[PDB]
Amino acid sequence: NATFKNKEKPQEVRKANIIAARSVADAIRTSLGPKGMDKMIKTSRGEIIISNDGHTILKQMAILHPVARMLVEVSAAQDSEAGDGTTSVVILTGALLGAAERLLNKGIHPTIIADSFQSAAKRSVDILLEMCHKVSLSDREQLVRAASTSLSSKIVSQYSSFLAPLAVDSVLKISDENSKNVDLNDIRLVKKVGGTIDDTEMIDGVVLTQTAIKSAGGPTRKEKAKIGLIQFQISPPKPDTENNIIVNDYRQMDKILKEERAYLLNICKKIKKAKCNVLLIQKSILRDAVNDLALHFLSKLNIMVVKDIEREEIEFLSKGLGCKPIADIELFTEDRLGSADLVEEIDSDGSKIVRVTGIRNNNARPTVSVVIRGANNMIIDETERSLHDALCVIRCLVKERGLIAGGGAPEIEISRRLSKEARSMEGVQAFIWQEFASALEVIPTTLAENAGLNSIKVVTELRSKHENGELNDGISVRRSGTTNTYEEHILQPVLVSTSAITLASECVKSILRIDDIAFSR
Template identity: 25%
Template sequence: CCQRFQVFSFSCPKESKERNPRENSATPTTDLCGLTLPSPNMQSPVLVLKDSLTRESGSKVHHANIQASKVDINTTISSNITHVKLAFGRIVVTNDGNAILRELDIAHPAAKSMIELSRTQDEEVGDGTTSVIVLAGEMLHVAEAFIDKKYHPTVICRGILFLILYYSVDLHNLYSMVVRSFAFAAYNKALEDALAVLDKISMSIDVNDRSMMLGLVKSCIGTKFTSQFGDLIADLALDATTTVGVDIGQGLREVDIKKYIKVEKIPGGQLEDSKVLKGVMFSKDVVVPGKMRRKIVNPRVILLDCPLEYKKGENQTNAELVREEDWAVLLKMEEEYIENLCVQILKFKPDLVITEKGLSDLACHYFSKAGVSAIRRLRKTDNNRIAKACGAVIVNRPDELQESDVGTGAGLFEVKKIGDEFFAYIVDCKDPKACTDAMSVARNILKHPKLVPGGGATELTVSATLKQKSSSIEGIEKATVAFEAIPRTLAQNCGVNVIRTMTALQGKAKVRSMTVLLVISLQHANGENAWTGIDGNSGEIADMKELKIWDAYNVKAQTFKTSIEAACMLLRIDDIVSGIKKRQAPGASQPSKPTIEQEGEADNEQMIPE
């Protein structure tokens, strides 16, 4: 059993002679980017490491990171449906990239960074987890050729518009022209141009048109669920997100699905029994089922974050009882304390009292006698949702209660038994702000009511537009590579031939058929149809607008941003320090230790004299 740790060291623009072979003088010089480079004779930093540590640096690290990103990750999630056999005999079958990656046991630090990339994409927009990994891995693959030619990673990152998005044959001409002209603005310009293309081809929609919204959500989650339940899931997701949506002004809408929406999974029943509750549901029952009401219409709700029981001493508390009556006095003091708490609550005439802490039997007696239902030991998250749903305020002390703290926004409180468990419902709320991928898609459309075509059409349009923008640079033969990874993967999953190269096509006088990817690329380059993509069912070229295959605008924009920035980050890593600490197996004999003279310690290391 081993414990592994890694240390990343990011390379700086200033590099030694090994990283920039064009610098030969001992005095600082300036490269084509206008950066001052140090002399190769300057002293390098000295690192003191343990004997058990291993260190790798230079181009070896770059190649290892690129290979780990391509092989370990891309080959796992590029297929339509991936199954992974895990420990303890568990098997996961899914096409969600993040669901697969979080179950993998990855050791390489670069591959771990790619997994974090997918997790970040999922948390930010809830979709596009596979696309961002495929696109980032393809960008690293294209940049590998320039690493072989000893180009500095910082230069590659700055010239990402031409170095990563396109593959150049004339490397020296590329360095002399592209780096000089676009050293400082190419990276930002590439993102700006890509996002500008998204704005150009995007289509605004009316979020109030329910039939259109249902069709869009269904098309976006078509691969997540079976077609039998697509309409049901889309309807539930749209109802949930529109329920918790808040207009924040200036035409913007905020939809916080993490805070206000909870998916409760209950064993038993069928998927058709699923529904959206305009309120809160939690697995609790009233404290005294026989004496407290389980159904209340228009309840007055009080939420507490304090116990309704006698306080116990934090440490050992001793009480000396001299007379027999002293024990009765102590019990009476406890009763008076709890009675006082209940009186302070009951004077506001509540119908339901919910606390996150304990509730004594005496307090239950007072509440049931007054006709008040009570629930105890509720989770903090559920209590917060109830407060948002019914308009109540969580109170820490009963003596601080005010009339404005009582929640009156709930229409119905009811306790139902489903299977072997009881569930409490607080529904029909006036402001109910209380299937995850589906809700993420609906949320993205509500927040940014723009759509872009799916089926790889967006990536090919961005690629063709950027290629036209760079046509003014002479001596550079360019072919779009990185952005074409998405439609190429789609075509491969459809069983279409996409491997045939341009050289083979040009070498034949008569070509009966071209690859699907080349035909679509020509159409996008000629500006014939920006909506042309690949039909995932048949593998044929089709109009995504007619097939109603869409992607949310902000999902695609976030995919471009995250993948490009992650590729640059991994390219700048040129030093890895890793170590393995072996743990002692249980029951194993302890090895003999040499005699050590305690002369000092540095980072828990002991000095052994010679």
């Protein structure tokens, strides 16, 4: 026949948008699952990396297309809210965009597509909630099992029996029962080489990466301490401008040397007058945090000094200990000091790690630090990496309580449910809902492919088995087939699946609404 000509062709932009975005999603798709494939990336600086980390791939993918880059923000939002599923949400987005492309080819306006997909997404969330197996954050065993399970894909899985409950106590210290949103940024992970994995502590205070006094005579440990934050540098005067000094006798140079020493001492003495026991000095590249001579003078004053403390560490000190930043030297006063019962440096196989513990003050805030030890860099890195994931899994259990079986289980169930519920819909919504349900299958399809299994066979077995089961049937790479998701311990927090449905739908909404791009300079 013949229909609207649309001499102006914004559809060319919508096509380019979907084509570019689906290409990114199809690329990352191959990395889904414990059996997923690795990628090689040569970066713009010439360094070549191999990784299967979804976010790292997209970050180093160097996406240029103005719309496809949205999938990077999707993986960031997934990592920010859930902390897991950063690959799945991108794959789902791609499949939904493919569904949108077919709908566009059928003459469905992108406004209709976006609105109908949102309605289907709302039902998917409800279905996920119905499938949840509820847990309580008061039941440490439920949380340890959830954390240890997610850590089964790590290089060292055996020590999860100890790292998992550490993550639980770290979260519960900040996730009291009457809460929903838990901010894990209050849990600082501080690592040093030395010791082994078991030698890991959950601390109710602030732990630093920096050492105590290096100079002779320093106390290096204070009890019943008042703690100040120094943002100024304690160093001899070194003006950046021009100065012309004439020295004709050694007596003049001695006066100059006395000026440098007296300056450092005068600061040290003024600090002591504030009754401060521990000096925690912010790192700066302008001048040295504390001169060697200042450490000598401060040591004689029985003051403990911790130099070159990172900016982020200062933010943790100023929240936990009750201490406040001190911008300048004359502003150093008692009112700016915090509280701690003991400040000490611990030397565990040369760890040289400083800990501030025992605030014992109403200024205490729910800050958490973790002390990570291990002989090799790989030991402390794998410990840190494992705790980061364990904390995110537990956070998910607090925000949206319960776990749902993995292996594509909710994707098969939701697809079947929406396929049947669509039968109650009319018009474009009925057809679009069917396309949404079909798009969901990209996940159990991809998992079957990467596991070495026949795609159609695995997906077909799951769809039929869900006639009797709900969440118990899914893909197990361990058993290389469709088996019992619970007996195989294949569990994913509700928040992760819920976030993937929401964010993928929001991305498709955002992409379909783009009909043009203009330059602005």
